[PDB]
């Protein structure tokens, strides 16, 4: 039924001695892997606790060992058997008693579901509980389960370790697999939650393995095909049992995989040679996490020394002896004493945990005893009355070294901290085909990257980033999809990227560079005489300089002879100065200064044109008045109209400021690499047209009076010469207006107007001086 | 200890017989108001259940009555006593037994905490529970408490009824008050949650009343001052006990309140005379919600007929007898038999609930027994093995009539539906000063609005809306603040409200209306001859029409006499037609047609103006050529230049399309109510200037020719007449430009330019008409 050990203070114990069988009977056959090994461990702990004078020197400690049969309902009935001893008041019945048996704590509930039940029924009666094999993450809410403590870390720490290895090694795609039950699902659920909470990682696959059958071998193909749908995902994490992973590896081998994606194992994978067989090539490179294992020396010596006639407190030892050696009292066994010789048994990894659990209880009880009373040699009555939340507080704040090297402690929640060591499988080049240690995880991940290569490869050989990092000079961040990985699209070539996250538009009037770092147009467009067509006008201007160097030559000496006296001296000075004025104007407009000095050039063509025609205007009137019927008088009237032209540009300056702007923008989207720039001063089509039209207005009033001049027998050569010039001048002016209309639609017209205007002035001036100088050469050759 | 009743099937019972006292002893004195009345009710129910052949005919029903002492820890020790009888297996001890007592259900846990605790310990063992006095809303989660049922509705239904009355009667501002414990806080929390879930209501105040002392009378002044801060909130809901509300009403009375805000009571307020004393004026109009009460006739007869020698099963009856009459075995009592005479006792309102609870349990067992086995007369063995979720399912699906008229049922959650009746206090017009019924609440609110009139006024007199309706013709919705109640602001005056929630800008070119419903401008601006200054030009045009009827009068007969022959005949016809053409132009431009007929008008001033000067042009040339040294030739040269004017409008037709637009926009923000509009065809400043400027060229040439013509000894009066007219027109043409520029900045110039143009055309013609008149009067006089 239950083992009873006498003592003034006792603690209970739940262990799965038997195993559940058919639906009818709660439990049938016995189990040796976890049934008797753990009981003997607890009994051994109590024996040496009572022997040790360091802990509880003057007070003894007892216990009540008991079994659960691995059933929730059976656990509840038994847990009530602890507490009824103190809760029952009395019984009004007689047959024709026993000590109260006050318990102080309970140690057990190895499973998960039985722990949840026992925690729920003992939370009400305020009795502390310490578990040793309950790894489910559900028993982690302090509010939900007040009185509960664990010496074994849950799966949440294991999931944290995996995501730390994935994060540190560098990966973005991970595929999760899980088996049936409450282990695989809770593992991946924690893994997903931590990844979402920490950020930077994502889940791309999530397949579930049912347990309706094991001899199908089709669902395995379904999942492996599902995992192969995206070749980029090369890392998978597994939470299944050993049989499942054995099947998956077999499927991968028979499928002749070409990607050979990496695995990440859980505690079920661990370090065991049984699962791997003929799959050593495909299982290579699998990172597995396993809890640290320690072997004690005291328990083994104790357990190997017990026999039937030595100890009788244990009620299930005889049945275990019968089942272990397979002999019943048709084979009989008497005094074999070969438990450690006939059977090659090895202690489990959880024996160290139950020994630590008993210790933590004994230490907290020991501190509570010392703090409550110190003036009493034995057991003070204050201890019996005090119990409940006080002992739980002492259990949380405990710190010591157990049977293993590592210490034991409890954090805020109440579970022991996680300590794992990472393993890896290497066979293609390693001296030993077995697993090799590569790192540990206690509080921060400590992993030797250079220690793992698994042959013919660097430690960072595999890549899984969901997108190749795009840095060819263009980048942009798109919100579409999961925030895990980013997609980059080529933005327009007319602007550069800002903060490596967006393509903002750069300020105008300048092209972007090639590497998309700055937006500036170094190249510019400038007018040149040699390269563009401006050479021909330049040659024409040079030719005009030669012409005026010959007209004015025969003027210095020929100033008093009675040959030039026929022409008026005052009129001769006007034409001499007018011819030189236009020669300087064409040279000025040809040149393109950057500074705002064109103001002195615009008057050369605006005001310099009037004085050229002024002498011709008064000359026509002078030769016509003598036909219809004071040289200083003709000088005055011409001087007056010069002032009109001079005042014309002055009032223009008062109308609007003479601001000079050299900046220009092409604003062409056809060729973003092209950058056309033009600089001009006071460039207005109306300004140049109206200023030039002033001469045309007075030329009309002069030509009309010249119709009657033709045929006068005064100077036949001179009269015929003037009439020839008039028709030529009207020709160039009549052709000038059509030019700018219907042609400014393009972008290269900024330099063509200047050239055509240049040759127009030279052509109009050459014809004027040609007829004027025609009679002058007669006195030279003749 | 506990009352035990024999039976093959039994159910347990928890009742608070005693009350907790000092810290040492768990419970001390007994309570009569809830201790013994409820037990005797349950015992009576069991007796008549066993007597009634309708339910469980061949099978009896027993029970185990037991007390809880109103302690959480004590309730646990008792619950274990129920469950141990069936869960315990055996006990290995001897002294030198009792019936198994299999329970099937439990009825009890009156309080709130003990119900939560008992529900927690029995949920694990899967034993159904029915409570009768647990009204807390926490016991309403089916997931948290599987095996739990209630015959008394929780407080959530009460909070729903209040918010339904506030919503139905129409209010928006409410203030919440609550007391200490787990009743007031949970009540208002539910009220707040339902208000937010249903919507349309808000909480403006939330004050909390501690319970550290009872003789301070200061905290009440603080809260009433807090509640008086906003005069708008005239409705408060209270969840406190009777002592608290008695103090608040006293505080309101001594504060001489002027707002007299309304109250809404809870179940604690109910319908009692204790809560009202000298405050009848200020408590008037308090809507209170109370559960329906019914009185049974069987229990009273049973309880009044029991005596010490009659019944012995009850173990606490003797102590109750001693405490009820206050006599101990220094006053002794023997055989009084005046329980119903010496004490004026009345049964509680919860007795009907325990009787319903016992019934629901009996019916569910009756159905389960009938459904499970029907071929056996007695108790079939299947019933003992069957238990757990099945009986719970049969308890949920039950429906019958209990001791009261109303039936009992359980909804999806497991708590009985709420059924209340609404009360109100009235003491001015009603003959009866007491409370009067005004409505009921079972599934939908049924309230008689016309039946309640508080404050000696109309029913719906008080309102609390946070704001007036604010519908003066325009409104805007503001998101600031709580969505419950809103603030309205006046938007700009130039647009109307859209969907009664926003002020969008209506299309321009018109004005909005006054009620903010439409955006259209009916009024328009049209030129009139009578009202504006256009009368004077109109009268001038009429004067010219009369004047021209005199020049042509002496022209038909005087065509062959040798007096008029001095003037050119062809010239006379030209000037005769020119005068009549201008007379028609001034009339056409005066009129403003809306139709597309202005094209025939513009030619009157475009082409009809040149023909007026055409005769004048050739007249001056004709008299000048004879001075420098063929009537048909003069006719041809004038006829040609008319064609140029005729072609002038032709090229204008092909240059731009004659699009006519009558719409106009003032775009003035100074007067939003003003709407100015002008309709004109082809309104361009340059068009009228250039068309009129063409005639200036020819007139200028005539002016210079006439100036040189002066002094010729050919005509005396005619030469003097033509000299003066050439000097008069230049003045008005020179002044036309100054008034044209720098004047159009306003908005009323659309019609002032026409008037001045009309007069200008008339006066420019009268000077010519007067010049022709002088020769006419001369020949008449001569």
Curated annotation (Swiss-Prot), chains A, B:
Taxonomy, superkingdom: Eukaryota
Effect of residue 107 to T: In NEDSHBA; does not rescue axon outgrowth defects when expressed in a heterologous system; decreased protein abundance; increased proteasomal degradation; decreased homodimerization; decreased localization to the cell membrane
Keyword Cell membrane: yes
Chief subcellular location: membrane
GO MF terms held by the record: adenylate cyclase inhibitor activity; calcium ion binding; glutamate binding; glutamate receptor activity; group III metabotropic glutamate receptor activity; PDZ domain binding; protein dimerization activity; serine binding
Membrane-topology descriptor: Multi-pass membrane protein
BP GO annotations: adenylate cyclase-inhibiting G protein-coupled glutamate receptor signaling pathway; adenylate cyclase-inhibiting G protein-coupled receptor signaling pathway; axon development; chemical synaptic transmission; G protein-coupled glutamate receptor signaling pathway; glycosylation; negative regulation of glutamate secretion; regulation of synaptic transmission, glutamatergic
Tissue: Expressed in many areas of the brain, especially in the cerebral cortex, hippocampus, and cerebellum. Expression of GRM7 isoforms in non-neuronal tissues appears to be restricted to isoform 3 and isoform 4.
Cytoplasmic side: 559-570, 708-720
Pfam families: 7tm_3, ANF_receptor, NCD3G
InterPro entries for this protein: ANF_lig-bd_rcpt, GPCR_3, GPCR_3_9-Cys_dom, GPCR_3_9-Cys_sf, GPCR_3_C, GPCR_3_CS, GPCR_3_mGluR7, GPCR_3_mtglu_rcpt
Ranges annotated as spanning the membrane: 534-558, 571-591, 598-618, 635-655, 686-707, 721-742, 758-782
Residue ranges annotated as Extracellular topological domain: 1-533, 592-597, 656-685, 743-757
Compartments reported by the entry: Cell membrane
Annotated glycosylation sites: 58, 401, 429, 515
Modifications the protein undergoes after translation, according to the UniProt entry: N-glycosylated.
Phenotype for residue 601 to W: In NEDSHBA; uncertain significance
Entry keyword Phosphoprotein: yes
Sorted UniProt keywords: Cardiomyopathy, Cell membrane, Disease variant, Disulfide bond, Epilepsy, G-protein coupled receptor, Glycoprotein, Intellectual disability, Membrane, Phosphoprotein, Receptor, Sensory transduction, Signal, Transducer, Transmembrane, Transmembrane helix
One GO CC term, this protein: axon
Annotated binding of L-glutamate, by residue: 112, 133-135, 183, 267, 350
Functional note: G-protein coupled receptor activated by glutamate that regulates axon outgrowth through the MAPK-cAMP-PKA signaling pathway during neuronal development. Ligand binding causes a conformation change that triggers signaling via guanine nucleotide-binding proteins (G proteins) and modulates the activity of downstream effectors, such as adenylate cyclase that it inhibits.
Family as reported in the entry's similarity comment: Belongs to the G-protein coupled receptor 3 family.
Subunit structure: Homodimer. Interacts with PICK1.
Disease note: Neurodevelopmental disorder with seizures, hypotonia, and brain imaging abnormalities: An autosomal recessive neurodevelopmental disorder characterized by global developmental delay, hypotonia, severe to profound intellectual disability, early-onset epilepsy, and microcephaly. Neuroimaging shows cerebral atrophy, thin corpus callosum and hypomyelination in a majority of cases. Death in childhood may occur.
Protein's UniProt name: Metabotropic glutamate receptor 7
Gene that this sequence comes from: GRM7
């Amino acid at each position: 039924h239950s083992i009873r050990i006498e003592g003034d203070v006792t603690l209970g114990g739940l262990f799965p001695v038997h195993a559940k069988g058919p639906s009818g009977v709660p439990c049938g056959d016995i189990k040796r892997e976890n049934g008797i090994h753990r009981l003997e461990a607890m009994l051994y702990a109590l024996d040496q606790i009572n022997s040790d004078p360091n802990l509880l020197p003057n007070v003894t400690l007892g216990a009540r060992i008991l079994d659960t049969c691995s059933r929730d309902t059976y656990a509840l009935e038994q847990s009530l058997t602890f507490v009824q001893a103190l809760i029952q008041k009395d019984t009004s019945d007689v047959r024709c008693f026993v000590k109260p048996e006050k318990v102080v704590g309970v140690i057990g509930a190895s499973g998960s579901s039985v722990s949840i039940m026992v925690a729920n029924i003992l939370r009400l009666f305020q009795i502390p509980q310490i578990s040793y094999a309950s790894t489910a993450p559900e028993l982690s809410d302090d509010r939900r389960y007040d009185f509960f403590s664990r010496v074994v870390p849950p799966d949440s720490f294991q999931a944290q370790a995996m995501v730390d290895i994935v994060k540190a090694l560098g990966w973005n795609y991970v595929s999760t697999l899980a088996s049936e039950g409450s282990y695989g699902e809770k593992g991946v659920e924690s893994f997903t939650q931590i990844s979402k909470e920490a950020g930077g990682l994502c889940i791309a696959q999530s397949v579930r393995i049912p347990q309706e059958r094991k001899d199908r071998t089709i669902d395995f193909d379904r999942i492996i095909k599902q995992l192969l749908d995206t070749p980029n995902s090369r890392a998978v994490v597994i939470f299944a049992n050993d049989e499942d992973i054995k099947q998956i590896l077999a499927a991968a081998k028979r499928a002749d995989q070409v990607g050979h994606f990496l695995w990440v194992g859980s505690d079920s994978w661990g370090s065991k040679i049984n699962p791997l067989h003929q799959h050593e090539d495909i299982a290579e490179g699998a990172i597995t996490i396993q809890p640290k294992r320690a072997t004690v020396e005291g328990f083994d010596a104790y357990f190997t020394s017990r026999t039937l006639e030595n100890n009788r407190r244990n009620v299930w030892f005889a049945e275990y002896w019968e089942e272990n050696f397979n002999c019943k009292l048709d084979r009989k066994c008497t005094g074999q004493e070969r438990i450690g010789k006939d059977s090659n048994y090895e202690q489990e990894g959880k024996v160290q945990f139950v020994i630590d659990a008993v210790y933590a209880m004994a230490h907290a009880l020991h501190h509570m005893n010392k703090d409550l009373c110190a003036d009493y040699r034995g057991v003070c009555p204050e201890m019996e009355q005090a119990g409940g939340k006080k002992l739980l507080k002492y259990i949380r704040n405990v710190n010591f070294n157990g049977s293993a090297g590592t210490p034991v402690m409890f954090n805020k929640n109440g579970d022991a901290p996680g300590r794992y060591d990472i393993f890896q499988y290497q066979t293609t080049n390693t001296s030993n085909p077995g697993y090799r240690l590569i790192g540990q995880w206690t509080d921060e991940l400590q992993l030797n990257i250079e220690d793992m290569q698994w042959g013919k490869g660097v430690r960072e050989i595999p890549a899984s980033v969901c997108t190749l990092p795009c840095k060819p000079g263009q980048r942009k961040k798109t919100q579409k999809g999961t925030p895990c990985c980013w997609t980059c699209e080529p933005c327009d070539g007319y602007q550069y990227q800002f903060d490596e996250m967006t393509c903002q538009h750069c300020p105008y009037d300048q092209r972007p560079n090639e590497n998309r770092t700055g937006c500036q147009d170094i190249p510019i467009i400038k007018l040149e005489w040699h390269s563009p067509w401006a050479v021909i006008p330049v040659f024409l201007a040079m030719l005009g300089i030669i012409a005026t160097i010959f007209v004015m030559a025969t003027f210095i000496r020929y100033n008093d002879t009675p040959i030039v006296r026929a022409s008026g001296r005052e009129l001769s000075y006007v034409l001499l100065t007018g011819i030189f004025l236009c020669y300087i104007i064409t040279f000025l407009m040809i040149a393109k200064p950057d500074v705002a000095v064109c103001s002195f050039r615009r008057v050369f063509l605006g005001l310099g044109m009037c004085i050229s025609y002024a002498a011709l205007l008064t000359k026509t009137y002078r030769i016509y008045r003598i036909f219809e019927q004071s040289p200083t008088s003709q000088l005055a009237i011409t001087s007056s109209l010069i002032s009109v032209q001079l005042l014309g540009v002055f009032i223009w300056f008062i109308v609007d400021p003479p601001n000079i702007i050299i900046d220009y923008d092409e604003h062409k989207t056809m060729n973003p690499e092209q950058a056309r720039g033009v600089l001009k001063c006071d460039i207005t089509d109306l300004q140049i047209i109206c200023s030039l039209g002033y001469s045309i207005l007075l030329m009309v009033t002069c030509t009309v009076y010249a119709f009657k001049t033709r045929g006068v027998p005064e100077n036949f050569n001179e009269a015929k010469y003037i009439g020839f010039t008039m028709y030529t001048t009207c020709i160039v002016w009549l052709a000038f207006i059509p030019i700018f209309f219907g042609t400014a639609q393009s972008a290269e017209k900024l330099y063509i107007q200047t050239t055509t205007l240049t040759i127009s002035m030279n052509l109009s001036a050459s014809v004027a001086l040609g007829m004027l100088y025609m009679p002058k050469v007669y006195i030279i050759i003749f």
